[PDB]
From a paper:
The PotD-PotABC protein complex in Escherichia coli, belonging to the adenosine triphosphate–binding cassette transporter family, is a spermidine-preferential uptake system. In general, ATP binding, hydrolysis, and phosphate release trigger conformational changes in the transporter, leading to the uptake of extracellular polyamines. Here, we report structural details of the polyamine uptake system PotD-PotABC in various states.
Author numbering:
A (entry chain C): 5 to 253
B (entry chain A): 15 to 374
C (entry chain D): 16 to 373
D (entry chain B): 7 to 279
The structure:
Amino acid sequence: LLRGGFMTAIYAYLYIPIIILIVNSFNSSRFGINWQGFTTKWYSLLMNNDSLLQAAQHSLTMAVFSATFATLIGSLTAVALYRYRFRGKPFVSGMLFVVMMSPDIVMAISLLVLFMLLGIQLGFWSLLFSHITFCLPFVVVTVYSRLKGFDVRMLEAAKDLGASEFTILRKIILPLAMPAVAAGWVLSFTLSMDDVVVSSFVTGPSYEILPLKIYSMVKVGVSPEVNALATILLVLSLVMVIASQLIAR
Amino acid sequence: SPLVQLAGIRKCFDGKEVIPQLDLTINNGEFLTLLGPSGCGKTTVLRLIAGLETVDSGRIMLDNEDITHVPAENRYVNTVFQSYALFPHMTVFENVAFGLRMQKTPAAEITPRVMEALRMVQLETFAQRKPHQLSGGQQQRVAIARAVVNKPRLLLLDQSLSALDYKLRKQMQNELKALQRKLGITFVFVTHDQEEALTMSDRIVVMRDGRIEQDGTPREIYEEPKNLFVAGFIGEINMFNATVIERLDEQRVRANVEGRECNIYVNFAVEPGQKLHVLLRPEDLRVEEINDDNHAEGLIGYVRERNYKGMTLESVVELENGKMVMVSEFFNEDDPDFDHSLDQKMAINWVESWEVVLAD
Amino acid sequence: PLVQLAGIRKCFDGKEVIPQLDLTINNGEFLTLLGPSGCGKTTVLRLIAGLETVDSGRIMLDNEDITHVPAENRYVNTVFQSYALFPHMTVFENVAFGLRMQKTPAAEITPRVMEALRMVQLETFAQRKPHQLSGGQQQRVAIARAVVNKPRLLLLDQSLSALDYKLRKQMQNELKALQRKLGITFVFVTHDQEEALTMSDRIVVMRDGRIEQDGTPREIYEEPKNLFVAGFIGEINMFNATVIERLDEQRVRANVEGRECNIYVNFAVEPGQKLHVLLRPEDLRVEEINDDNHAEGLIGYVRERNYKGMTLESVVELENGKMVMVSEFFNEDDPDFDHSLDQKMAINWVESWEVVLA
Amino acid sequence: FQNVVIVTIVGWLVLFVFLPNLMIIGTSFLTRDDASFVKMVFTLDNYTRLLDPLYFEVLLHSLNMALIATLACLVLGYPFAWFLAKLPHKVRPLLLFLLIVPFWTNSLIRIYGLKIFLSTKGYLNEFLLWLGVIDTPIRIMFTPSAVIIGLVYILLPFMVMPLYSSIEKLDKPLLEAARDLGASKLQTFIRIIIPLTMPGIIAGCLLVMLPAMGLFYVSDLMGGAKNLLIGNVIKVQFLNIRDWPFGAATSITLTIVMGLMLLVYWRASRLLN
Ligand SMILES: [Mg+2]
Ligand SMILES: [Mg+2]
Ligand SMILES: [Mg+2]
Ligand SMILES: [Mg+2]
């Protein structure tokens, strides 16, 4: 009982702010500290707001695209590392480890100076590249861990039975690695939907996303319309995860 | 009729000569076993034949066709692995039909062949089950059926029955030998077990450090060893020292062994002063009373230990010089005349013409 | 009496593993629990060691109840199958772990550890991690770690299963000598029958969590109790028979496989009762062709001769349709050995050397 | 096939990760310009300015604030991972998944919600007064304690997962051998479990300490002007004052710390294996 109680406290720690912002969405008070009745006004005001909805759309588009490209590249790299045995495998693992365990501020400023030394405008392309860059290692680790739990002699057995490589990667590896691919996609989507530090450095006025839009409103005050946006984004993000499991199944 | 002819095979891995130089021929319709200690290099030969490894230098034939560089997808050679290398998601039926599908076999013939292959190994009712729902003995049969369904010219087995228990291993040792005769294709087997090789094989090649020591029938290996390693590896032997005194006739030679004189049967030519090794096996030595001996001359020693091993009694006998000699015999506890005395003067004898004389 | 078990029961995932077990382990002896795979021997070993808790019954050690005492407070040490062998410590610290964790004065730790390492012939590999050693070395380190606390009972769990065939034969004798040197009781769980026959002073045979027999190694091989113990320890030949009349206090006439013979029975029988006659393969003789008034009792054909190296196994077929599986030694250089294959042959034994079961 | 995948992944990492890092370290040695940003004049003025007391107190404050957050995660994270390893295998993936559900809402909104939850007249002060645990309202906003509470919130999941992986890979017989030889639960932890799971601890510390020194929105929304993190210093120099060479000099301190913790990871792994 004491063990179960401790686990509940940590879950109650993280989930309480989400419950507050969901509940304060229906509150009438602009500041949100107290409870002063039930109103629906905030949702209607959100429906007529254009910049907020555009920022939400841009964030979702970035998340989907970054997740897809990162999943593809990481899955191919993981299959490459697992399939072959070569001298450079520890070195690639070390580079991936160092990339994963690196500060976000250094990675942001480095990409800033790189994109300013090449004359590339800050916007869609810079943001997409940054998200792919910091999403790859997790996909690689997930797929590698999933694949290493199976025997490697099945590939030799497939060779002896008269199968080319592409057949081997289209009949054996992929059905055993699809549930890892789905998890990699979901994890990348979450990481791209959560980040605030890199986006605030490698973006431009042409493309606006939710982090900087909310950061601008902070200096004046955050209306409860933002709380009305967060509750909808929870439901939309929920169904995408539900769909991914069914497709992988 | 030769099938595989290996000439001048060499292979080096990480600065190590695994196979110095090998000459070997495999005939048609036999059971061949490669037997030796751990790390002798049998798996390298198996993989080179199968095509999963490439030879540094040499030539390989199959039916008078050079496949030294043909990849391991067009050869008519099939392999059974130690870990059974089974695809988990596929069923038994698809596991068997994999090789037929990637050979562009017409769709009408697939089901009868697969069902026949499963019937050959007694698994016709487990067609729709998956692995992880099968015991070890079943998974092994699935692997054999998957290998045999392509009608290959040669089947390679790599320590196939190692992970199983005793009685099941003994029973599958017999079904494999029956299956080889039923089909009619050559089997090549790699094992570390002596009795397993001696039971099911028609030709044994003993390998040590990448070289061939002896090749012959099982009887020609257990009964007529060529050197000391082969004698000591298969079975268990006693090493005696001898010096030649004189020769009586063409096949009988007088010599001293551990300080005692007796007649021995030597066929090849020897000269006085030459040292020899006389080898005797535990089941061929006899311990008899010397008080009423009055029969012939023999070795003298004491009995130290009597070990009861179930069906057999193993005795450790110390000679006067100090060499250890061990004698094996059946245990008959209902026989009134059964020796049980310890620490007594008794003689060691053997019946004439049962020795193996090897020069040094 | 060292350990006494009374009414022990245990259930795991609803399936019973030990219905009811009564056992007494004495002082200064070698005991082996031998049986097929999955019969609850490991459960008994872990129950004694203290790594599992019983559902009913009592466990005693020197007449003090230890049913609920944790494993740290029992005087029992165990050697594991996989040689636990903490990877971040040297051999010296591996051996000295138990001494260090019972609050032992620092002056006695080094000599005791050195002596324990010397008893297993590892005195010079004192400073080496357990990855620079081989299988035998690791096994000896585990044994030395177990025996340095001076325990009242040592438990071994398939200790020598992963080694080769010659090292196994050496270490069997080594352990048998070490037991006499120390003077404490050993409990060994094994799946190989030859080891139990050559290493034990008392064998307990278990099947489905129940005791089938208990006695000297001689008793199990020579005098089986039921039909299961025979045929598990070696090979057996079961012949059916029908009792006719009791000739005397020792010999009883019976009809074996349609022919008459005299057999030895040591209990009360009545005409018409069904009997089982068991004979080992090596106690049967396939003698010369049927000679009038010389050899009688069975009739059969050879039908096979298998060569196995030292021995030769012949599986003969009777007149009724039954295999007999005779065994014998292979003497090739003896110029009267018989290589006959499919003619009329005779089967005999020595009028005794048979085990009769009711 | 084999070559295409390796070249692409290596080319992507060297172009986007490694080469730009060498540009930052080489930018800390050159000279500022108003319109040309960096000018090719080798100077050591950038590094020696970090020893001024004004810019040295800010760095010292960040280390203390991040170090305590790392310690708080370890104290609250090791027990959580340990208890999750004593559960049925089927329920474990669901419990882990419920740790990343909060991440779908952006981080800059979740801190805004927590600020309302901890306000003087907000919840968790009215409820405590109604319960009677406290007598006068607790004021922790714009204090060093508020930042540490916020940092633990965001980065706690990142520490749990490395620890759970190391614990689940433990060998059960090793834990049973100690219990047989006379180890209490405490002595097993000090002498066996912790050394066997040390690389998991160092991996979690890297993922919680270094990111905790660059989160500038926690300090802006919860700490104030007296309690700042290093990320606030770098952000101003790169986006408002446009003194790029100084920002490179400050960012070097984070890189230097990374090497020290990485070295421990390599040395801890070699001894264990
Ligand atoms: Mg006998
Ligand atoms: Mg001979
Ligand atoms: Mg013989
Ligand atoms: Mg008897």
